[PDB]
Enzyme design. Structure first.
Site, short mmCIF file in Angstrom:
data_model
loop_
_atom_site.label_atom_id
_atom_site.label_comp_id
_atom_site.label_asym_id
_atom_site.label_seq_id
_atom_site.Cartn_x
_atom_site.Cartn_y
_atom_site.Cartn_z
N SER A 175 0.84 -1.18 0.00
CA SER A 175 0.00 0.00 0.00
C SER A 175 0.87 1.23 0.00
O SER A 175 2.05 1.19 0.36
CB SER A 175 -0.93 0.02 1.21
OG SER A 175 -1.21 -1.29 1.69
N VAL A 232 -4.30 0.73 -1.90
CA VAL A 232 -3.63 -0.57 -1.98
C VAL A 232 -3.18 -0.75 -3.44
O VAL A 232 -3.83 -0.22 -4.34
CB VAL A 232 -4.43 -1.81 -1.46
CG1 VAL A 232 -5.40 -1.44 -0.32
CG2 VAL A 232 -5.14 -2.57 -2.57
N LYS A 273 -3.14 0.77 -8.70
CA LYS A 273 -3.56 1.36 -7.43
C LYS A 273 -5.10 1.42 -7.43
O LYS A 273 -5.72 1.85 -8.41
CB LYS A 273 -2.96 2.77 -7.26
CG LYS A 273 -3.29 3.40 -5.91
CD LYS A 273 -2.44 4.63 -5.62
CE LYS A 273 -0.99 4.28 -5.33
NZ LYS A 273 -0.75 3.76 -3.95
N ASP A 280 6.16 15.35 -1.34
CA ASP A 280 6.69 14.40 -0.37
C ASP A 280 7.82 13.61 -0.95
O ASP A 280 7.77 12.38 -1.00
CB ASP A 280 5.60 13.47 0.20
CG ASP A 280 6.02 12.69 1.44
OD1 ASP A 280 6.83 13.20 2.22
OD2 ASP A 280 5.54 11.56 1.62
N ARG A 336 10.53 6.65 0.57
CA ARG A 336 9.25 5.90 0.65
C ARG A 336 8.39 6.11 -0.61
O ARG A 336 7.49 5.30 -0.88
CB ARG A 336 8.43 6.33 1.89
CG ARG A 336 8.13 7.83 1.93
CD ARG A 336 7.26 8.27 3.10
NE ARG A 336 7.32 9.73 3.24
CZ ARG A 336 8.26 10.37 3.92
NH1 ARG A 336 9.20 9.69 4.57
NH2 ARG A 336 8.30 11.70 3.93
N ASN A 337 8.67 7.21 -1.37
CA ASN A 337 7.93 7.53 -2.60
C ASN A 337 8.71 7.31 -3.88
O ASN A 337 8.31 7.83 -4.93
CB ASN A 337 7.32 8.95 -2.54
CG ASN A 337 6.28 9.06 -1.45
OD1 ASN A 337 5.45 8.17 -1.29
ND2 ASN A 337 6.32 10.11 -0.66
N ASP A 383 4.80 9.99 -8.29
CA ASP A 383 4.25 11.33 -8.03
C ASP A 383 2.72 11.42 -7.87
O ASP A 383 2.22 12.52 -7.62
CB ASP A 383 4.75 12.33 -9.09
CG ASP A 383 4.32 12.03 -10.51
OD1 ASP A 383 4.85 12.65 -11.44
OD2 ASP A 383 3.46 11.15 -10.70
C1 LIG Z 1 3.67 0.52 -2.86
C2 LIG Z 1 4.42 -0.37 -3.87
C3 LIG Z 1 5.92 -0.32 -3.53
C4 LIG Z 1 3.87 -1.81 -3.83
N1 LIG Z 1 4.14 0.12 -5.26
N2 LIG Z 1 3.33 1.17 -5.62
C5 LIG Z 1 3.34 1.38 -6.92
C6 LIG Z 1 2.39 2.37 -7.58
C7 LIG Z 1 1.31 2.00 -8.40
C8 LIG Z 1 0.40 2.92 -8.89
C9 LIG Z 1 0.56 4.25 -8.51
CL1 LIG Z 1 -0.59 5.41 -9.11
C10 LIG Z 1 1.60 4.67 -7.68
C11 LIG Z 1 2.50 3.72 -7.18
C12 LIG Z 1 4.14 0.39 -7.51
C13 LIG Z 1 4.65 0.07 -8.84
N3 LIG Z 1 4.29 0.81 -9.91
N4 LIG Z 1 5.49 -0.99 -8.97
C14 LIG Z 1 5.92 -1.65 -7.85
N5 LIG Z 1 5.58 -1.45 -6.57
C15 LIG Z 1 4.70 -0.38 -6.45
#
Ligand SMILES: CC(C)(C)n1[nH+]c(-c2ccc(Cl)cc2)c2c(N)ncnc21
Length: 264
Positions: free
Chosen positions: A18, A23, A38, A129, A133-134, A147
């Site tokens: 998440s 999530v 997401k 931010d 973590r981002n 972003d």
């Molecule tokens: C949190 C985690 C590390 C599982 N996570 N989050 C995103 C992600 C997906 C959609 C949006 Cl809009 C923003 C971020 C993501 C990704 N693309 N690939 C791998 N892990 C991801």
């Protein structure tokens, strides 16, 4: 239009974790592409806020920014479909695999983030931010900034209200925590904290101190110390991000060209 994807062309697989605003699930798109989706729950964020966000993410395509493919918005949960970035979150990656990295690899991670941020800056956007973590790490260890729901339009040398999501104060510039305003250099301060996280292998900044203590200490001139793995040249670059005054901080364009000759 091109922003809307066919929902039947997305199959969700396991939960990845998440973040945000939602999530994230691993998925397959058009029976071929690995995606991270997401889930935007009904009521979690505004309907009209969602359109602006989705459009901004679509506009801002860059190799060092998480690639946005489209949305499935006709029904809830709304899907935000992006590229799957196989090594996941940068912070977790540094904490689990950081000991195996060379300092030249740590610098390359900082360079990747800087390049994505220079692109946002060239479009008059800041990241609200900017922190490990981002950021996400791909199979080849290339770092991408995430972003979604974390940008703000701000013209150069201007100030905008900080009203909205309150993000961690240890990554916040004084204009943010003191005056409740973002400048075009508020994310440059955060980027210096992000370089410190990278070179510290994911340690928490000011780890001994509460958020109240950090606001006071930073106002008094106290700054993060040189991480062991950072050269003095690299420390001078992160340190330059932390001037109390936005005017005295470099832009991401200047940071990028400062980092360029230090690579490999
Ligand atoms: C949190 C985690 C590390 C599982 N996570 N989050 C995103 C992600 C997906 C959609 C949006 Cl809009 C923003 C971020 C993501 C990704 N693309 N690939 C791998 N892990 C991801």
């Amino acid at each position: 239009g091109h922003m809307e994807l066919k929902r039947e062309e997305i199959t969700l697989l396991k939960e990845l974790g998440s973040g945000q605003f939602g999530v994230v699930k691993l998925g397959k798109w058009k029976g071929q592409y690995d995606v991270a989706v997401k889930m935007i729950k009904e009521g979690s964020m505004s309907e009209d806020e969602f359109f602006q966000e989705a459009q901004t993410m679509m506009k801002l395509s860059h190799p060092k920014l998480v690639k946005f493919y489209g949305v499935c918005s006709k029904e809830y949960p709304i899907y935000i479909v992006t590229e799957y970035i196989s090594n996941g979150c940068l912070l977790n990656y540094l904490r689990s695999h950081g000991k195996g990295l060379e300092p030249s690899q740590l610098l390359e991670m900082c360079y990747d983030v800087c390049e994505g941020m220079a692109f946002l800056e060239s479009h008059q956007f800041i990241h609200r931010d900017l922190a490990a973590r981002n950021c996400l790490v791909d199979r080849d260890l290339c770092v991408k900034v995430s972003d979604f729901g974390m940008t703000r339009y701000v013209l150069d040398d201007q100030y905008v209200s900080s009203v909205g999501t309150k993000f961690p104060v240890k990554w916040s510039a004084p204009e943010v925590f003191h005056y409740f305003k973002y400048s075009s250099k508020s994310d440059v301060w955060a980027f210096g904290i992000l370089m410190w996280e990278v070179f510290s292998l994911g340690k928490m900044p000011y780890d001994l101190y509460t958020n109240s203590e950090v606001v006071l200490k930073v106002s008094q001139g106290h700054r993060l110390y040189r991480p062991h793995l950072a050269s003095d040249t690299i420390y001078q670059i992160m340190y330059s991000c932390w001037h109390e005054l936005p005017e005295k901080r470099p832009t991401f364009q200047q940071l990028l060209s400062s980092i360029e000759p230090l690579r490999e």
